[PDB]
Write a protein that binds this ligand. Sequence first.
Ligand SMILES: CC(=O)N[C@H]1[C@H](O[C@H]2[C@@H](O)[C@H](O)[C@@H](CO)O[C@@H]2O)O[C@H](CO)[C@@H](O[C@@H]2O[C@H](CO)[C@H](O)[C@H](O)[C@H]2O)[C@@H]1O
Lengths: 296, 304
Amino acid sequence: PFSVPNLPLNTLSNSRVPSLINAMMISRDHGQMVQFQNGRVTLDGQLQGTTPTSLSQLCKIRGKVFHASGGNGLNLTELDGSAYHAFESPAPIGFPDIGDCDWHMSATATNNFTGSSNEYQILIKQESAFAPHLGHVQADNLSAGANTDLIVSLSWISPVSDQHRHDVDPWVIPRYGQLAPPIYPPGFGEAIVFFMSDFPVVSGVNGMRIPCTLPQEYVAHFVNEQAPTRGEAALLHYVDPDTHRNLGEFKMYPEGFMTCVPNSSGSGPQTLPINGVFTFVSWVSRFYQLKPVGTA
Amino acid sequence: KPFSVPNLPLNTLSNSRVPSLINAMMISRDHGQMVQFQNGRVTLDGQLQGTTPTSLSQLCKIRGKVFHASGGNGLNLTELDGSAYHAFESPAPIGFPDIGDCDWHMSATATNNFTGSSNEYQILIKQESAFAPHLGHVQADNLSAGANTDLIVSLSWISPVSDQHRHDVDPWVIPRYGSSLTEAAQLAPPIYPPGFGEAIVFFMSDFPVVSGVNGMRIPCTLPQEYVAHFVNEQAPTRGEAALLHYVDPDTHRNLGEFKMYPEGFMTCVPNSSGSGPQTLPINGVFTFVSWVSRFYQLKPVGTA
Ligand SMILES: CC(=O)N[C@H]1[C@H](O[C@H]2[C@@H](O)[C@H](O)[C@@H](CO)O[C@@H]2O)O[C@H](CO)[C@@H](O[C@@H]2O[C@H](CO)[C@H](O)[C@H](O)[C@H]2O)[C@@H]1O
């Protein structure tokens, strides 16, 4: 039988940055199409894009340092050190999927870590030399010796160094060179539900907020259960865990995203409490029409 | 509601004491006769203990407001979602690091109007007199942020104590949460190997550790994703121990048997003073077989 975790939203992580969920929102501006490569899984538990099972892999890069005149960089591996296969994913698993911005990152030596001299604050730009699908990225302020093995964490993001735009749009994915497919709102006034987390973002279009389509812990749940998809959509109730009151109904599609219908041009799930739990009710057809959620 | 463990290969899951992929299993006679880790702690029926979070997004994080004092700067702790820390329910805020008797090198970001490089702070949290997380404050070195600044702080690396009283990092020990003043309340209880010739199984991850007793290796008693699974399922504990097989996910062969106790830890029996599960592949899955008595005798696992 299909289930979603019996876990309050505000105890779970974003699937695009390692940060607690603190809000739900819908977006007319940005919610017309999304093609996030992280937080992507089918309801029967098929991982897509660069999506890991574990948050320990999310927004991480691993590789060996190269030195070139045009600039230093990393020859990418998987985070466990095994070889990256171009034919399996658009980048190594857990590779950040926030496009068209500067990545400020913290790299540590994986071999004989000595301390401060084996930690490197580096800048990865999304310019010509950014080719994760080919297995290499260019890094600025990377002083480590050639062939040094580094594990790299995303610290913060900021507007592109080359100034071709002055803000960060976290709704866009990188130009990698097997992309998780685009997701569109399915029709009849349904809007994609985005799980929001705060993250250090300089001049973000939505501020210091990062959207995703699934809590990370839902991803691990589907990959574990592998429950057969027995319908066109899973009808969910969002319920108060104390009272067991139905705060609103939502559809989860086999592609592994959620929709609601907002109340007459309203904010939809944005006004709901964030300490609620989603609960599977039943499989429903494409024809099923959701009771509008939230305020006018 | 039947008890289960996640059908997920070990090497795709996280340590529950640092956010790092599991790359090994080991037993320890030296360190493994008692452990009292505060993270990765949950009962098989899904009761969180110590400082253990559901989500890895909370693990090895600190949140607080900066204070400036003569003795030095520090953080007045909150929970990671910014809500107030109450001493009664935990030894420290949820997800607070539980690696004792070492220096914490950490990365702090401003949670309000983040401007860039000047709103990221490389800071040092020492475990000396002013380390009092249970009382809701820690002293922080090399912290330049203005008073009352709200910071979210991630563990970057750990190293031997600044005060030189030891020269290595023992990741098997937990912090003194109440300092010299009090013993912290709601500590997750100590755990010992229960059965005949049984050793506690430790899930190992690589982490930047300077001069670690086990090098760059951090032990825990549960993969983090198992914690979220038990808290989700809340399966009634119907026996004294859960018998598991560790199975090849493709091949499907049973690579060894293990016992999981209601306290939320696992044991094996090593072969004649051997490395036990250390020689097993790390891409296996644990599978629930049945409820057995505490007395049930495990087939020895591993070589030597
Ligand atoms: C190997 C060593 O001694 N490392 C320490 C480092 O030494 C410097 C320098 O002072 C030294 O003369 C020379 C080689 O011996 O070059 C090295 O780069 O100095 C740093 C900075 O203080 C120490 O780091 C600190 O050590 C503390 C324990 O004594 C504690 O772990 C702190 O957290 C850590 O920052 C090196 O230990």
